[PDB]
Write a protein that binds this ligand. Structure first.
Ligand SMILES: *[C@@H]1O[C@H](CO)[C@@H](O[C@@H]2O[C@H](CO)[C@@H](O)[C@H](O)[C@H]2NC(C)=O)[C@H](O)[C@H]1NC(C)=O
Ligand SMILES: *[C@@H]1O[C@H](CO)[C@@H](O[C@@H]2O[C@H](CO)[C@@H](O)[C@H](O)[C@H]2NC(C)=O)[C@H](O)[C@H]1NC(C)=O
Ligand SMILES: *[C@@H]1O[C@H](CO)[C@@H](O)[C@H](O)[C@H]1NC(C)=O
Ligand SMILES: *[C@@H]1O[C@H](CO)[C@@H](O)[C@H](O)[C@H]1NC(C)=O
Ligand SMILES: *[C@@H]1O[C@H](CO)[C@@H](O)[C@H](O)[C@H]1NC(C)=O
Ligand SMILES: *[C@@H]1O[C@H](CO)[C@@H](O)[C@H](O)[C@H]1NC(C)=O
Lengths: 104, 49, 50, 171
């Protein structure tokens, strides 16, 4: 509606018997291939990402926002638990870190 | 051609007016497209036609 | 010639493969719309009969 | 082909020129209409050889290669359901085959890359995962889809089958 890409903002300019809109959009660039999974299995529980998606670099699993690669350690603060590891198809085994563990 | 969208509107309307004016030079079957020539040449009973 | 509809491209689809952008571009595009016409007016009687 | 009439017609001015121009403008517009609707991709996207989308079957909307027209089962159904006086008809710039190709590119794009191809580069994503994102969009948590994936795929597949049955019947 407001140009190709993800709309950020627009600026009007007047013209002879008309108007010109300059549309500023965000366009993704330089994508990379990652291995993904619908959920992480840990302690018999199925963990899902709260905001992003689970990805792997071939050896380690991370959670990242969807529109920009910015990998973070998978923790109880960026996932939620729902059910066991028997239902989800394609669930993978990976540790989920608990930030309180080092304190106790 | 960046602003063809605006120029096209101008061109279409200019063309419409030019056509409207040019039509005044047509006879439409009359002896003359000029109204004054009809009135000068013919008596009223024929000029009206 | 018979026109082409664009370059052929197949996405590397699999059941466990995802592509994620590591960068971005800020793009600015223009869109032009007509808003108004010239406000003409014609005097019928004068046009027809002078 | 009457010269006597033609010579009389000239005395009415440019009425014929105006009429020819009006009809030409319409004819051109008809190609613009088709172009704006269908030609929304700069690339022609193809589906994978292996149609594994997590139980989601799209065979009724994807092109059927056994047909010379390369139309889907549903499209083929839709197409089956629907001079002496100086009158002519001009051909469209895009043929039915070309329009079908645009449609299949749109379908292939959506299935394999979701909405990403419509706002930049086409980024692959597992179909079940794409649906999971779409569930979030409508205010339903992702886990609802993953825990009901078989049910959702079945409801989807049945709904598509019903579409063909409806169109083939309702006159
Ligand atoms: C993201 O892309 C931008 C360009 O859009 C990159 O910035 C350019 O980097 C090159 C060096 O590789 C410089 O020569 C250019 O002058 C830079 N352009 C601008 C506008 O700064 C940026 O480095 C990329 N980011 C990453 C992580 O690759
Ligand atoms: C996708 O759905 C289509 C339509 O239901 C399936 O095609 C049927 O396959 C069975 C088994 O070979 C045939 O007996 C039917 O006659 C086919 N129907 C039609 C309209 O062709 C297709 O097999 C399904 N694909 C998958 C992977 O399940
Ligand atoms: C992802 O892998 C495919 C091959 O399976 C390759 O064609 C494609 O270019 C890769 N994508 C990226 C960003 O490297
Ligand atoms: C994945 O990331 C971890 C942490 O940065 C790194 O140690 C590991 O070597 C990476 N694996 C690959 C294949 O790059
Ligand atoms: C992908 O398909 C393979 C079978 O080829 C299956 O073993 C695997 O669990 C599937 N992964 C996902 C995420 O569906
Ligand atoms: C994940 O770990 C459990 C044991 O905790 C094991 O039974 C299961 O088979 C493992 N899954 C995979 C894919 O290795």
């Amino acid at each position: 509606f407001c140009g190709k890409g993800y709309h950020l903002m627009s600026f009007p300019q007047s013209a002879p018997h008309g108007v010109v809109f300059l549309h500023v959009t965000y366009v993704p660039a330089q994508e990379k291939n990652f291995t993904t999974a619908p959920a992480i299995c840990h302690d018999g529980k199925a963990h899902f990402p709260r905001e992003g998606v689970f990805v792997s670099n071939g050896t380690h699993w991370f959670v990242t926002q969807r529109n920009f690669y910015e990998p973070q350690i998978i923790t109880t603060d960026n996932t939620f638990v729902s059910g066991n590891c028997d239902v989800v198809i394609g669930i993978v085994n990976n540790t989920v870190y608990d930030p309180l563990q080092p304190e106790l | 051609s960046a602003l063809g969208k605006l120029q096209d509107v101008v061109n279409q309307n200019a063309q419409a007016l030019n056509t409207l004016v040019k039509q005044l030079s047509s006879n439409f079957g009359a002896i003359s497209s000029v109204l004054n020539d009809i009135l000068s040449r013919l008596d009223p009973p024929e000029a009206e036609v | 010639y018979t026109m082409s509809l664009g370059a052929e491209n197949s996405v590397a689809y699999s059941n466990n493969s995802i592509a994620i952008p590591t960068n971005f571009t800020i793009s600015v595009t223009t869109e032009i719309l007509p808003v108004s016409m010239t406000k003409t007016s014609v005097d019928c009687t004068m046009y027809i009969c002078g | 082909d009457s010269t006597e009439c033609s010579n009389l017609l000239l005395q009415y001015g440019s009425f014929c020129t105006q009429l020819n121009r009006a009809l030409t403008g319409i004819a051109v517009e008809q190609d613009k209409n088709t172009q704006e609707v269908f030609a929304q991709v700069k690339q022609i996207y193809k589906t994978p050889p292996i149609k594994d989308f997590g139980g989601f079957n799209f065979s009724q909307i994807l092109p059927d290669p056994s047909k010379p027209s390369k139309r889907s089962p549903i499209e083929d159904l839709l197409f089956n359901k629907v001079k002496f006086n100086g009158l002519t008809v001009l051909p469209p710039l895009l043929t039915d085959e070309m329009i079908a190709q645009y449609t299949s590119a749109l379908l292939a794009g959506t299935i394999t890359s979701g909405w990403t191809f419509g706002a930049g580069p086409a980024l692959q994503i597992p179909f079940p995962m794409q649906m999971a994102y779409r569930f979030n969009g409508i205010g339903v948590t992702q886990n609802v889809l993953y825990e009901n994936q078989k049910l959702i795929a079945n409801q989807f597949n049945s709904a598509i089958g019903k579409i063909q049955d409806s169109l083939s019947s309702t006159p």
